[PDB]
A paper describes a structure:
Here, we addressed the organization and regulation of Spindly, a farnesylated mitotic regulator of DD (605 residues in humans). In early mitosis, Spindly promotes recruitment of DD to kinetochores, the structures that connect chromosomes to spindle microtubules. This function of Spindly is enabled by the 800-kD hexameric ROD–Zwilch–ZW10 (RZZ) cargo complex, to which Spindly binds directly through its farnesylated C-terminal region. In conclusion, we have studied in mechanistic detail the basis of Spindly activation at the kinetochore and shown it to reflect a structural transition from a closed to an open conformation.
We then determined the crystal structure of human Spindly1–100 (only residues 2–97 were clearly resolved in the electron density), a fragment containing both the CC1 box and the HBS1. Spindly1–100 forms a parallel dimeric coiled-coil, similar in its outline to that observed in structures of other adaptors captured in complex with DD. Thus, both SpindlyFL and an N-terminal segment of Spindly are stable dimers. In Spindly, Ala23 and Gly27 in the CC1 box occupy a and d positions within the coiled-coil’s heptad repeats, similarly to Ala43 and Gly47 in BicD2, a pattern also conserved in BICDL1 and BICD1. This unusual composition for a and d residues generates a cavity along the BICD2 coiled-coil axis that interacts with aromatic and hydrophobic LIC side chains. Indeed, Spindly and BICD2 interact with the LIC with similar affinity. The ≈23 nm CC1a coiled-coil, partly captured in our crystal structure, is predicted to encompass the majority of the long axis of the Spindly dimer (≈28 nm), in good agreement with values derived from 2D class averages of negatively stained Spindly samples and small-angle x-ray scattering experiments for both SpindlyFL and Spindly1–440. Collectively, these observations indicate that the Spindly auto-inhibition mechanism involves a tight intramolecular interaction of the conserved Dynein-binding CC1 box with a regulatory segment of the Spindly CC2 coiled-coil roughly comprised between residues 276 and 306.
Residue numbers in the entry:
A (entry chain B): 2 to 98
B (entry chain A): 2 to 97
The structure:
Amino acid sequence: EADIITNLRCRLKEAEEERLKAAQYGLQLVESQNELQNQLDKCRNEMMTMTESYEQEKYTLQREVELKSRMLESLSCECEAIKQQQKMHLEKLEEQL
Amino acid sequence: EADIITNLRCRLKEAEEERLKAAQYGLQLVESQNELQNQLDKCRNEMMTMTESYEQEKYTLQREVELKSRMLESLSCECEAIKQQQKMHLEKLEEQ
C-alpha cells in the first residue's frame, strides 16, 4: 500500500512533465499565431495606404497628360494655321510674278 | 492513507486531462495557423500584383508626358519663330 504511493509519485512526475511540454508547445504556437495576426493586420494597413498613394499619383499624372494633350492640340492647330498663312503669301507672290 | 492516495489519484487525473486539453488546443492552433498563414500569403500576393500593375501604369503615363512635353517644347519654338517671320516681314512692308 506504500508501494502504491511510489508508483503514483513516479507516475505524477512523468505526467506533470508531459503536461508541461504540451503546455509549452501550445504557448509557442499562440505566440506564432499572434505574430502572424499582427503582421496580417499590418499587411492590410499598408495595402490601403499604398492604394490611396498610388491613386493620387495616378490622378495627378492623368492631369498632366490631359493638359499637355490640350496644349499640344491647340499649338499644333496654331502652327499649321500660321504655316498656311505663309503658304498663302508664297502662292500670291508667285502668281503676281 | 486513502487520504493521500485519494488526492494523488485526482492529481494525476488532472495532469492527464490538462495535457489532453493542451494537445487539443495544439491541433486547433495549427489548423488556424495554416489558415492565417494563407490569408497572409494572399494579402502579400495581392500587394505585389497591385504594386506591379500600378508602377507600370505610372511608366506609361510618364512616357506620355515626356513625349508630349518634348513635342510641345519643339513646336512651341517653331510657332514662336514663324510668328516672328511674319512680324518681321510686316515691318519691312511698313518701311516700303
